[PDB]
Design a protein around this ligand. Structure first.
Ligand SMILES: [Mg+2]
Ligand SMILES: [Mg+2]
Ligand SMILES: [Mg+2]
Ligand SMILES: [Mg+2]
Ligand SMILES: [Mg+2]
Ligand SMILES: [Mg+2]
Ligand SMILES: [Mg+2]
Ligand SMILES: [Mg+2]
Length: 121
RNA sequence: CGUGAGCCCGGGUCGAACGGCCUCUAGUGCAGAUCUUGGUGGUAGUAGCAAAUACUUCAAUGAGAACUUGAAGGACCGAAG
């Protein structure tokens, strides 16, 4: 599986956290752009957090590829996993939650016949 | 996984509903407003519990007695009490 691709180079493997999200408990860790008039992060002072922008974008050839080389497709049926019959070299099944224990077995059983990778077997 | 808002999965709890996609709709996104309501801290076992002179012994009750009771002693209000 995972036919062939250029090496998956990630320009930044960390992520962006909100300014002062570590000091205050009311401030979530999800990124929000600092819009204050005196904010040091927004003014890009040396030694502060970085802001998300294009330029950190991933290569288009490897944009949504997991490290194996597949792209994740959410599957919740035996009929849904059969959509990847022709794309088993580029897409990998990912059994969503809410799928009962019995239906999970059938999806694993069928995706094995199709030689489709399952990311949460 | 995505530059990002976010999305997805595994593990634990739980017990009755829920989601994707295309359109339509809105009381639709919070860190502040000496914001509103509710809850909780440090301070902190901290400030303090110091006016009106004052209590002590024995016994009983009782799981437990300085401020319950009886007896004895010592005091105060001192009749515009
Ligand atoms: Mg019920
Ligand atoms: Mg509103
Ligand atoms: Mg809110
Ligand atoms: Mg708030
Ligand atoms: Mg306030
Ligand atoms: Mg004290
Ligand atoms: Mg005092
Ligand atoms: Mg008189």
């Amino acid at each position: 599986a995972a036919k062939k691709h250029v090496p998956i180079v990630k320009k930044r493997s960390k992520g962006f956290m909100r300014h002062q999200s570590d000091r205050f408990m009311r401030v979530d860790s999800a990124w929000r752009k600092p819009k204050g008039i005196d904010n040091r992060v927004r003014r890009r002072f040396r030694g502060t957090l970085a802001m998300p922008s294009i330029g950190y974008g991933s290569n288009k050839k490897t944009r949504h590829m997991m490290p194996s080389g597949h792209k994740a497709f959410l599957v919740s049926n035996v009929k849904d996993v059969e959509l990847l019959l022709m794309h088993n070299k580029t897409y990998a099944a990912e059994i969503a939650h809410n799928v009962s224990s019995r239906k999970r077995i059938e999806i694993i059983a069928r995706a094995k016949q199709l030689s489709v990778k399952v990311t949460n077997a």
